[PDB]
Amino acid sequence: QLIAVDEKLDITTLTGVPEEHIKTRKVRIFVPARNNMQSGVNNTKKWKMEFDTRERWENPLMG
Amino acid sequence: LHHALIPHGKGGRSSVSGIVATVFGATGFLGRYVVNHLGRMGSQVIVPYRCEPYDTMHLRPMGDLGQIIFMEWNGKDKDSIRKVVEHSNVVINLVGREWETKNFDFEDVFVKIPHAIAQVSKEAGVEKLIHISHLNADIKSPSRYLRSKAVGEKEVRAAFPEATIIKPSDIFGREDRFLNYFASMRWFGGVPLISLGKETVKQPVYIVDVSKGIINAIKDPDAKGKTFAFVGPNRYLLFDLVQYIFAVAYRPFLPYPLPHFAYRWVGRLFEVSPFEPWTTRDKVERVHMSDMTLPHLPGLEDLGIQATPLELKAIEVLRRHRTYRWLTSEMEDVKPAKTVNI
Amino acid sequence: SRGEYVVAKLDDLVNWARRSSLWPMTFGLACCAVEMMHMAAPRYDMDRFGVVFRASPRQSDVMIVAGTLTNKMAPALRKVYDQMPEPRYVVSMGSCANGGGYYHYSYSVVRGCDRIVPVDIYVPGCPPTAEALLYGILQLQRKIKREKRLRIWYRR
Amino acid sequence: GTSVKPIFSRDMNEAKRRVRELYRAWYREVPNTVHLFQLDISVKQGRDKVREMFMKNAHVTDPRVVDLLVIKGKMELEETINVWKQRTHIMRFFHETEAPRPTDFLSKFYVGHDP
Amino acid sequence: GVRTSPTGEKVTHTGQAYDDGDYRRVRFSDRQKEVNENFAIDLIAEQPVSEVGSRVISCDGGGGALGHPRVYINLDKETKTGTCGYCGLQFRQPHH
Amino acid sequence: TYKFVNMREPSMDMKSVTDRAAQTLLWTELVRGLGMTLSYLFREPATINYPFEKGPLSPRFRGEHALRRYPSGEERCIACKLCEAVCPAQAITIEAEPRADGSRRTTRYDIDMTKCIYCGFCQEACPVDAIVEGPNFEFSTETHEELLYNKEKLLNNGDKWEAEIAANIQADYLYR
Amino acid sequence: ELVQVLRRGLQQVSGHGGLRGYLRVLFRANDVRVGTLVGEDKYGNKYYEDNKQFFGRHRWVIYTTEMNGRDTFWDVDGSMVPPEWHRWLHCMTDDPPTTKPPTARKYIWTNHKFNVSGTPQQYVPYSTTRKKIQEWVPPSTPYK
Amino acid sequence: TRPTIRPRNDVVHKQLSAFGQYVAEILPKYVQQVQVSCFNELEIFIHPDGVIPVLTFLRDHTNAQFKSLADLTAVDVPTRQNRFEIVYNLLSLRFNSRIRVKTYTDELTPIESSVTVYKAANWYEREIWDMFGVFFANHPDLRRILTDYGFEGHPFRKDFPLSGYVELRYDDEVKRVVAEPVELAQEFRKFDLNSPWEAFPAYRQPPE
Amino acid sequence: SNLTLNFGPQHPAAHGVLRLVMELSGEMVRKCDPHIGLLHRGTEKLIEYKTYLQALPYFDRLDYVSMMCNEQAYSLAVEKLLNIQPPPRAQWIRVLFGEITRLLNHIMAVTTHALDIGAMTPFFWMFEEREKMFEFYERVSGARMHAAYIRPGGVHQDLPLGLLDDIYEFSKNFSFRIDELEEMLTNNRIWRNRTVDIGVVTAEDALNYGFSGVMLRGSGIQWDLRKTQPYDVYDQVEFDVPIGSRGDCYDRYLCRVEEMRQSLRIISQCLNKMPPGEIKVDDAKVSPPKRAEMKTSMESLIHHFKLYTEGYQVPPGATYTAIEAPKGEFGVYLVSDGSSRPYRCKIKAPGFAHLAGLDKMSKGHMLADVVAIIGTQDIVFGEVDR
């Protein structure tokens, strides 16, 4: 009926994410800034969560 | 460091390791493992092949798109060797035939070809040259194989002074001739052993260990002029080694002594075949010769590798030789063989 | 010389025998296999080229990977490739089998069958027309014709 | 309070009991798996791998999360018993083809920009 | 109008060419390098200049619906020719 | 409105019963099937003699991609990147910069033929008829790398197939 | 009804240039049909049509025995038809280039090439973009 | 207004509204909300505990005989406290109508399985568990259906990456197919297509 | 203990990539356990990552046997969410090509089923007709099977000037091909022995298990979405719905043959009644303008740019739209959040429910009976796995 759990919520073990992408990632929670090229404000209404940028390299074929 | 050769990525398939390797003899037993380990890291591999291109098909999935380039070459032609190593910053030499053929004697395979490769690589500006010889390579050896190995090693050292030289000893693996060769003897029904194999000591080494040793020697700056001995952790008598081989395969063991002259005569008879010989006088000499001990040379443990014991990776090779009855038998129910260690 | 002529003639004969009778395995995964069916249809009639489907891998010469190769299916494709006796050839059909295609970025799709098996001929399209796959099969026949096994053995 | 409802276990003790049942089942199954799948590992290797996978998430203190983990463990055990898994799926627990990533600061600094 | 690098490699219209020490040139060994020999810049350079008696002209690339979107070019500047944004054709107003 | 497909009963008069017994004992319908197969045996087969004959196609057929030019020789592409934005498979990769004469042109135009789904959206989105899907379909390769087209390969394709691509567009541009 | 068929067969035999030509066409194209010569290629291909046959078999090509550099007596392929005859042969139009020639352009290839896969003329992909980041070049003069 | 605009149907709207009121009156213990969309589709938002009763009623009541379960799926909305939204689509052949039932759940709260009401749900619920991680309480046989054997995570989740975490390749040294961390030769290119100007004034939300 | 066998993926009768684990006593079947997901490519997540136009190509692929019907179902959903309406000519073209697609799917379903039963010749005879219908597809769109012709605003291009005549020529002769098929199959006693009283499903069980299409009509249930909930112009054509009596494989085979005949009837009606006019909705904010106007008009160029870069926005809302696809009720539950990319797109394929009910359908039967039951359900695994 009601077990009254007194623990902080934590679902890290059920999501299937490798621990490298849990203990090392740093997420950013923000309202995106308005694109200064335009005057419309419709893209500054909702909050967004993103991740830190990682390495991007040039693949030897086709660049 | 030639910016286009700066390492990038997490070391995976699409990653760049900044290595450009020309692997001579990549279509053999050790060559496939070396190419696989090179392609795992994202290295660029140039495979010079002389065989049918079909016979190189198994090397295609080993690398990413464009990371494995196949080129035709001729051993006796220097221009082909120049063409295949003109852009590589490391050259690995794995060319070698266990038997003598009508067009390529042991001198051609172990002395002339390695010397030409080393000379052309030095002239082309190749930074690193890995050469493979035998642990038992001696100039006084009764085997033409090992005498040629020693002479070719000396020539390679003379032509490429900063060449890393590796001396393995009877590599065993899935495609090896060493484990299979003993297993193959059961068809005759009697295992002929010179002096019952009671005066021959063997120190076989795992194939993955040798490939990892080559890879770690490529990336080790202080392994330029060094010579390495790649041997296993345990030493076995030949009799006990063959006993363990037949026990793992679950086959009846019937070993009998054969005089040296009779074994040499039998080896000669097999040698006459147009196709590759099951055994040859040279093979008889090499397989009944104790493995040399060289405590003054570095080994796998000096490259960060713990040698894999035979008892761990022997079932993966000999399970194929079991019958249907014993096909499902486990690994730890064979009571490993006795090791004469020091 | 004399041995060179004999090995060249024998190699030509064996290459012709292997080229004229190609037995693909009945193995289709997705949309492209429908086009494969249309090759067996009367209009194109692959049978007249010596190409006849056979079910068991042990009696097959060529694998045509016609469709998407998912992660769940890759072990089965590799297994039925390993059970084909040599000589064997692989023909990759369509964008999905070539490089992932429309599902290249999916979490459950292998980006090209060349990660699992070596491939001889890549046939592009989504799906390739029955004529495109017929052209691919004829190109595979030409490639088989070019191969030189006995000559290479003789010069060993 | 919190108006939460359990899946199977009311408290921590029932969850631990189910965990021990799952551990017994996996421990029993390991030798049969080694025989059927023709694995090259020993029974001890499989059993200590099972122990390691169990201990990988031994920090959980929520009975509901423990119940869900036990359910997933039962799913994997049923997949292994019925030979729905193949040899590759079983060996994917061992990561035999992956280079060991370094854990110290200096090697990570040498290798790349990833912390 | 193709050039040749010091290593004997053709230079593409985008100007790309591998350095002397670049290992990627090994991908062209026993093969060839794909280069289009009809360089567009020289081809559009040889086109003559159209003389029109208007301050504003219109260009659609030729062919009507088979050309580019129709644009208008101002020809009031005397020391310069009006150039189409899409086609690259040049127009001018009569002088001298 | 509906009809029944298997809701008929057979008449039980002695003539019909004897006819059914004759059918059972003498295999009349099996002979009818054999006759149908025999009739198909004596017809002309619908097989064409490929590669000496080809199946019919249409001007709207989508095949190998190509990049076209203006009659003056200038490239039509202006690097608007609409084809790249519309591609459902993300198979187009474009990099551009001002040319030496100031034109807005690409420095990289890559199409992954193994990612492409050959949908033709790219030639729909293009505003200058720069990128097209040509008529060719016999371009199988022996390696994966040969199906990764760069700008030079696509321009060569355009130069090679323009004589027919222009005719195909002329025969269908009024439907677009 | 039967002698007429045999006479048609003998007429087909005679219409290819005798027994040698009949055997050549039989062993090269696996078909001994005779039709009106619509045209001849620049490379030697001969294009025939016969409207009495059903759709798909009313237009065919006899390929040349020698293309640009390779012998093509036996190994022919469908990539050797030039684009104009490619458009005609695939029933994309009712008119041959001998009646409706294609528009002439200076940049169009004057020599068609077949599929060059597996040959030293195969296309090798590469990046067409210049270098992104330029490095610093240290001076060659010693600093002390 | 005539040629290009979809025409409205007022009669079906009235019928669906009346039937929604009827259902809400019959089952006040579970029904939280009723809606009729402008293209004449009827939705009933209920409490998670009422999945078995409501459906049973909608399957068995004489005035509402929805004997066919067309679909059963879940929707992931991370910003809600109850993450997953379970949707049942039912079809009534007797009255030629369609109805929708919606409920909610989170990562850890189970939902009663409706295999007793509809056999068709048997696989559908499995699919949900495979791709969203929603556990169904009394499912006779609940396991992965679409994903690979031993596949970790639930792909149809907003936080799950498009290309996953592992990719497969054949390794010759071990002679089998192995899974390794994903490494794309070309990264998926993210496009920001949203316009900065409001498109539909009718759906504007209050700025609080 | 029962013997356990793997049926598929690499099997002739596995119908693609289906792994079936069966417990057999002898050749009796004790339990069938279908294992799917060997063709699961994560279509729905990818659709979440594309625009409404970019996601259209995915739909043809879900069921690669009847591609045009899939696009139409999706198009109807997007049009309903957009609150717009295609022109009459577009709707008539849609219904005509939907009937052609039904013909293709039925020919494929009947012939493959016969092939599995062992009757090889019928498949060869009808695939020439399938090739002709592929020619029609390629002429109208440029691709033989993945046309992407039917758009969420109508169709892409108008018909070529000589297409209706060729469609009439094909339709006036298809009946004799159907008759030859029926001569070879319908009255054959081997065929009846193989199909009669095999895989019998009752009406109540078929309804509860989620069956649709012929799998309903074979049990006597009078249900067809083109008659009860018509969508495009199906209320302006007349045809009959075949109804079975026994619920076995034979009744469903007869129903499929009669459905082919009725679709020929509908094709004749569509050919006679095709109206003139435009082919896509005359709203440049949803459907792209003509290429002639995009190159002369500023508004047209702006709208073409914004349609092919960003795409049209769809007002927020959720819909479930279902059509009577040849394999059954094919539905899409589409959820929009006011963006130009769909928030959620759940695809309902009748093969899912049919394959789920296969285990109940194969109770007390043999192995060859199970092969027949797999054949009779008209299963394609692209739509099953998605």
Ligand SMILES: COC1=C(OC)C(=O)C(C/C=C(\C)CC/C=C(\C)CC/C=C(/C)CC/C=C(/C)CC/C=C(/C)CC/C=C(\C)CC/C=C(\C)CC/C=C(/C)CC/C=C(/C)CCC=C(C)C)=C(C)C1=O
């Ligand atoms: C819609 O959803 C889907 C499906 O749903 C239906 C699917 O199904 C599906 C899967 C579909 C694919 C797998 C493609 C499958 C294609 C179709 C299903 C069928 C197409 C072709 C069929 C197989 C029809 C075949 C029937 C015909 C009759 C073909 C002919 C059959 C042959 C086998 C008969 C002849 C056999 C061969 C010719 C071999 C015989 C040759 C001999 C053995 C050799 C000669 C014998 C010698 C040994 C003689 C030796 C003696 C010597 C002395 C002679 C002289 C020698 C000396 C040197 C002189 C997919 C993907 C799918 O998506």
Ligand SMILES: CCCCCCCCCCCCCCCCC[C@@H](O)O[C@H](CO[C@H](O)CCCCCCCCCCCCCCC)COP(=O)(O)OCC[N+](C)(C)C
């Ligand atoms: C046990 C008794 C038998 C012993 C072995 C003999 C078996 C019979 C040999 C059969 C001979 C026929 C083989 C080739 C037929 C000629 C066809 C010709 O076209 O082949 C060309 C070239 O063929 C080869 O050059 C000939 C192969 C045979 C070479 C001679 C072998 C002699 C047999 C010797 C056996 C024993 C030797 C003695 C030592 C023991 C290439 O053709 P291809 O391009 O593909 O097809 C064109 C396709 N088109 C029509 C669509 C355009």
Ligand SMILES: CCCCCCCCCCCCCCCCC[C@@H](O)O[C@H](CO[C@H](O)CCCCCCCCCCCCCCC)COP(=O)(O)OCC[N+](C)(C)C
């Ligand atoms: C006692 C009498 C018993 C008779 C029994 C009844 C009849 C049995 C005969 C069986 C008939 C077989 C079919 C014959 C069709 C003829 C095919 C021929 O026209 O094609 C030629 C095939 O030529 C072959 O040489 C003929 C092979 C036919 C005999 C094989 C039948 C197997 C039984 C005996 C095998 C011994 C073969 C010895 C010759 C190689 C063309 O090939 P080729 O001229 O090359 O061109 C390629 C080489 N080029 C490129 C340099 C020009």
Ligand SMILES: NC(=O)C1=CN([C@@H]2O[C@H](COP(=O)(O)OP(=O)(O)OC[C@H]3O[C@@H](n4cnc5c(N)ncnc54)[C@H](OP(=O)(O)O)[C@@H]3O)[C@@H](O)[C@H]2O)C=CC1
């Ligand atoms: N295998 C062992 O037990 C250990 C071997 N090592 C040494 O390591 C080297 C490789 O080992 P391994 O892989 O086992 O031997 P392999 O026989 O398996 O590999 C031989 C390779 O060398 C090529 N090759 C052989 N001869 C020539 C030639 N005349 N011209 C050109 N290429 C040739 C082969 O090409 P192709 O196949 O196309 O003919 C092949 O690619 C050898 O030099 C061997 O002596 C020494 C200790 C023992």
Ligand code: SF4
């Ligand atoms: S390449 Fe295209 S047609 Fe072929 S299987 Fe993939 S999606 Fe289907």
Ligand code: SF4
């Ligand atoms: S045809 Fe379609 S998938 Fe291919 S490049 Fe053009 S838009 Fe992209």
Ligand code: SF4
């Ligand atoms: S090909 Fe056309 S659409 Fe693509 S960038 Fe060039 S001009 Fe723009």
Ligand SMILES: [Zn+2]
């Ligand atoms: Zn212009």
